[PDB]
Amino acid sequence: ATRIEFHKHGGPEVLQAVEFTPADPAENEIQVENKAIGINFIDTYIRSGLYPPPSLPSGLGTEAAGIVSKVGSGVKHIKAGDRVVYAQSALGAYSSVHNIIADKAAILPAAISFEQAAASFLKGLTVYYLLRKTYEIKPDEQFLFHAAAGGVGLIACQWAKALGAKLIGTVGTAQKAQSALKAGAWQVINYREEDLVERLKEITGGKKVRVVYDSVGRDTWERSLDCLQRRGLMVSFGNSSGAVTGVNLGILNQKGSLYVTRPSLQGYITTREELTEASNELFSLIASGVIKVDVAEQQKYPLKDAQRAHEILESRATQGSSLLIP
Amino acid sequence: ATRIEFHKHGGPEVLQAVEFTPADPAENEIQVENKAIGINFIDTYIRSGLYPPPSLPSGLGTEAAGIVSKVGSGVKHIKAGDRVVYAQSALGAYSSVHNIIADKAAILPAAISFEQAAASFLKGLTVYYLLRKTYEIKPDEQFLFHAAAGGVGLIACQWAKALGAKLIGTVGTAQKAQSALKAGAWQVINYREEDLVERLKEITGGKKVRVVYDSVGRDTWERSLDCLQRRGLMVSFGNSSGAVTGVNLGILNQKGSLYVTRPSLQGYITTREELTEASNELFSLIASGVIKVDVAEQQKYPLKDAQRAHEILESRATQGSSLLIP
Numbered sequence: 232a233t234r235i236e237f238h239k240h241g242g243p244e245v246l247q248a249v250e251f252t253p254a255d256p257a258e259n260e261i262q263v264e265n266k267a268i269g270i271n272f273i274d275t276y277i278r279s280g281l282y283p284p285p286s287l288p289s290g291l292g293t294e295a296a297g298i299v300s301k302v303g304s305g306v307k308h309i310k311a312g313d314r315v316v317y318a319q320s321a322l323g324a325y326s327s328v329h330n331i332i333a334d335k336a337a338i339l340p341a342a343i344s345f346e347q348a349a350a351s352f353l354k355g356l357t358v359y360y361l362l363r364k365t366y367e368i369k370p371d372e373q374f375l376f377h378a379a380a381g382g383v384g385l386i387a388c389q390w391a392k393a394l395g396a397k398l399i400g401t402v403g404t405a406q407k408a409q410s411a412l413k414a415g416a417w418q419v420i421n422y423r424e425e426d427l428v429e430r431l432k433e434i435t436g437g438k439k440v441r442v443v444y445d446s447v448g449r450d451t452w453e454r455s456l457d458c459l460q461r462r463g464l465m466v467s468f469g470n471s472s473g474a475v476t477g478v479n480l481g482i483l484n485q486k487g488s489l490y491v492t493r494p495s496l497q498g499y500i501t502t503r504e505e506l507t508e509a510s511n512e513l514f515s516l517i518a519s520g521v522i523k524v525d526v527a528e529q530q531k532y533p534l535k536d537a538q539r540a541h542e543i544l545e546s547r548a549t550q551g552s553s554l555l556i557p
Numbered sequence: 558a559t560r561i562e563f564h565k566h567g568g569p570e571v572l573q574a575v576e577f578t579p580a581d582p583a584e585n586e587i588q589v590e591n592k593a594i595g596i597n598f599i600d601t602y603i604r605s606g607l608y609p610p611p612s613l614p615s616g617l618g619t620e621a622a623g624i625v626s627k628v629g630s631g632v633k634h635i636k637a638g639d640r641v642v643y644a645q646s647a648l649g650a651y652s653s654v655h656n657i658i659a660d661k662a663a664i665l666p667a668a669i670s671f672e673q674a675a676a677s678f679l680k681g682l683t684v685y686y687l688l689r690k691t692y693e694i695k696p697d698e699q700f701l702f703h704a705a706a707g708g709v710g711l712i713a714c715q716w717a718k719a720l721g722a723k724l725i726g727t728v729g730t731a732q733k734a735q736s737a738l739k740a741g742a743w744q745v746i747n748y749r750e751e752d753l754v755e756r757l758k759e760i761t762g763g764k765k766v767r768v769v770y771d772s773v774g775r776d777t778w779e780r781s782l783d784c785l786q787r788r789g790l791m792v793s794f795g796n797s798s799g800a801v802t803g804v805n806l807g808i809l810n811q812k813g814s815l816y817v818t819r820p821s822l823q824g825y826i827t828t829r830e831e832l833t834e835a836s837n838e839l840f841s842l843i844a845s846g847v848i849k850v851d852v853a854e855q856q857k858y859p860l861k862d863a864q865r866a867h868e869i870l871e872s873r874a875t876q877g878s879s880l881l882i883p
C-alpha cells in the first residue's frame with residue numbers, strides 16, 4: 232500500500248509517499264481500501280506543526296471513503312465488502328489502506344459515491360453541528376459566515392438556504408462571491424476589497440447579527456466582534472490565517488458582553504449514536520440533491536501529489552472541496 | 558456637599574474628600590441626597606487606572622440610596638421626597654448629593670432601609686442576571702461560584718439556595734467557608750489551601766459542572782476551565798486578582814469545546830423596563846427575608862474614610878458588603 236508521511240514539520244515539501252504493508256485490524260477496527268481521500272485545512276495545521284502529532288514520523292488525514300477489506304473480531308455492525316466513509320480516524324487516511332475504529336465509520340448509502348462522500352463527510356458533519364447545535368439557526372435569520380466559497384463554506388451556503396436562512400458570506404475574490412451566491416448565500420462581502428463592518432451594518436439595517444461563524448481566525452477577529460449584537464455569539468472554528476492569540480477577555484465586555492466558543496468536531500460528534508443521527512441528516516440532503524458536493528476535476532489529485540494539493544489549498548486558489556485519489 | 562475625588566491613578570491614598578456645590582439636575586435627572594453609598598470592587602479598577610475614566614480629576618462610585626431633593630423638568634416618574642436606589646449613575650456616587658439620570662433610579666419600597674439597598678442593589682442586580690439570564694440555573698443544579706463570601710458572593714449563596722440549586726463556592730479562609738455555608742452554599746472549597754480541580758471532581762463525583770461563575774480572573778483562569786464539562790460555559794465576570802489576558806482561543810477547544818463570556822451589568826440591564834423587572838425580583842427577596850443583606854458594623858465607614866474602605870476591601874479581609882455613610 233502507499234501512504235503519505237512526514238518526518239519533520241514544515242511546508243508542503245515535507246510530505247513524502249512511502250510504501251508499506253497494512254497490518255490487520257485490532258478487534259474493534261475495520262480495514263478499508265481507500266477509493267477517495269478528503270483534504271482538510273486541519274491537515275496543514277498538523278503538517279506545519281501548529282497541531283503537533285502524537286509522534287514523528289507521522290501519517291496525515293482522518294477522512295476517506297472506500298470498501299471494507301477486513302474486519303476485526305469484535306466488529307459486529309460492519310462486514311467485508313461494505314462501502315463506508317469516516318471523518319475521525321487515527322492520523323493516516325492519506326493512504327490506500329487504513330485501519331479505523333469501527334464506531335467512527337458510517338455505512339454509505341448506494342446513492343452516494345466515494346468521491347461525494349470524501350468531499351463532504353468531515354465538512355458536512357461540521358456544518359451540521361455548527362448550524363444546528365452550537366447555535367440553532369432559524370428561518371429568515373441573517374448571520375455571517377466567513378470564507379463562504381470554501382470546502383466547509385459552500386456546504387454551509389446550501390444548508391443555510393435549505394433551512395430558509397440568510398447567510399451573509401465573506402470571500403476573497405469576485406469569482407468566489409459568484410460561486411457562493413450560486414450555492415445559496417443571501418449576500419456576500421468581499422473582505423479583501425470591502426469594509427466588512429460597514430457593509431454588514433448596511434446589509435442588516437444597522438441591526439447587526441446574533442451569530443458569526445469565523446474560520447479565518449487571526450485576520451478577522453476584531454472585525455467579526457464588531458459585527459455582533461449585544462450578547463451575540465462569536466464562533467471561532469478555524470485558524471486559516473492563523474490562530475487567535477493574545478486576547479484580553481475585557482474585549483468581550485467592551486464589544487457588548489459577547490459569548491465566544493472555539494469548537495471542534497470531537498467536542499460534538501462523540502458517540503456512534505451522534506455520528507449516526509448527523510450522517511442520516513447529511514446523507515439525506517446530498518441524495519436528494521439539496522446539497523451538491525461534486526468536485527472540480529482540477530481539484531482531484533493523485534495520492535502521491537499530496538504536496539501539490541497542499542500548496543494549492545494554502546494559496547487560497549480553491550473553491551469547494553479537494554480530493555486525493557489512491 | 559462632600560465628594561471623593563482623585564487627581565491621579567494609584568492605590569487607596571490617591572482618594573480625597575473635597576467640598577463642592579451641587580449643580581441643579583439636568584432635564585432628565587433627579588438630584589439625590591445620598592443616605593448610604595455602595596462600595597463595589599469596580600471602584601478600585603477605576604481608581605487604579607485599570608478602567609481609566611473620561612478624565613482626571615474624577616469622582617467615584619455608581620451606587621447609592623437616598624431621598625430625591627430636586628427633579629428635572631422632563632422627569633415624570635420620580636417626585637421630590639421619593640426614596641430611591643441606583644446602581645448605574647455617572648461616576649460620583651461617593652458623595653452626599655449626586656445627580657442621576659432618572660431612568661437609572663428605582664423607587665425603594667418603605668420596608669427596605671437605605672443601608673440594605675446600598676448594600677445590595679448593584680450586587681443583587683448582578684446575581685439576578687448571572688443566574689437568570691447569562692445562564693439559567695436549574696433546581697438541583699451543581700455549579701461553581703468563586704469568592705462566595707464576598708459582596709456578590711453572599712447574595713449568590715442565598716439566591717442559589719432560594720432557587721433550590723447547589724452552589725459550590727470557593728473562599729480564601731476557613732472563616733469565609735462557614736459564612737458561605739450559612740448563607741446557603743451547598744459545599745465550599747478553600748482555594749488557597751486545597752486543590753480546586755481535584756476537590757471539584759470529588760464533590761461532583763467526577764461529573765464536573767456545566768457552568769462556572771468566576772470573578773477572580775487571572776489566578777483561577779486555567780483551574781476554572783478544568784472544572785467544566787464538555788461544551789460548558791465559563792462566565793468571567795470580574796478581575797479581582799487581575800484581568801485575564803494573553804489567552805489563545807485554542808484552549809477552549811482543548812478543554813472541551815467550551816463557551817466563555819465576559820459580561821457586565823450594562824450589557825444586561827439596559828432599559829427602565831429591564832431595571833424594573835430585576836429590581837422587583839430583588840426587592841421581594843429582601844422584603845421576604847430570603848436574601849439578608851445587613852452589613853457588619855465594622856464595614857460601615859464615614860464617607861471621608863473612603864481610603865480605609867478601599868485598603869480593607871483590597872486586603873481580602875471583608876465578608877459581604879461594605880457601605881460609605883455620608
Ligand SMILES: NC(=O)C1=CN([C@@H]2O[C@H](COP(=O)(O)OP(=O)(O)OC[C@H]3O[C@@H](n4cnc5c(N)ncnc54)[C@H](OP(=O)(O)O)[C@@H]3O)[C@@H](O)[C@H]2O)C=CC1
Pocket residue numbers: 270271272273353354357378379380381382383384401402403404407446447450468469470471472473494495496497544545546547548549550551552
Ligand atoms: N472546528 C471544526 O470542527 C472544523 C474547523 N474547520 C476549519 O474550517 C476552515 C475551512 O476548512 P476547509 O473547508 O478545509 O478549507 P477551505 O477550503 O475553506 O480553505 C480555506 C479558505 O479560507 C480562507 N482564508 C482566509 N485567509 C486565509 C489565509 N490567510 N490562508 C488560507 N486561507 C485563507 C480562503 O478563502 P478566501 O480566499 O475566500 O478568503 C481559503 O480558500 C479551516 O480554517 C479549518 O481548519 C474545518 C472543519 C471542522
Ligand SMILES: NC(=O)C1=CN([C@@H]2O[C@H](COP(=O)(O)OP(=O)(O)OC[C@H]3O[C@@H](n4cnc5c(N)ncnc54)[C@H](OP(=O)(O)O)[C@@H]3O)[C@@H](O)[C@H]2O)C=CC1
Pocket residue numbers: 596597598599679680683704705706707708709710727728729730733772773776794795796797798799820821822823870871872873874875877
Ligand atoms: N460583571 C459584572 O456585572 C460585575 C462584576 N463584579 C465583580 O465581581 C467581583 C466581586 O465584587 P464585590 O462583591 O464588590 O467584591 P468582594 O466583596 O467579593 O471582594 C472580592 C473578593 O475577591 C476575592 N479575591 C481573590 N483574589 C483576590 C485578590 N487577589 N484580591 C482581592 N480579592 C481577591 C477575595 O475573597 P477571598 O479572600 O475569599 O478570595 C475578595 O474578598 C469583583 O471582581 C467585581 O469586579 C461585581 C459586580 C458586577
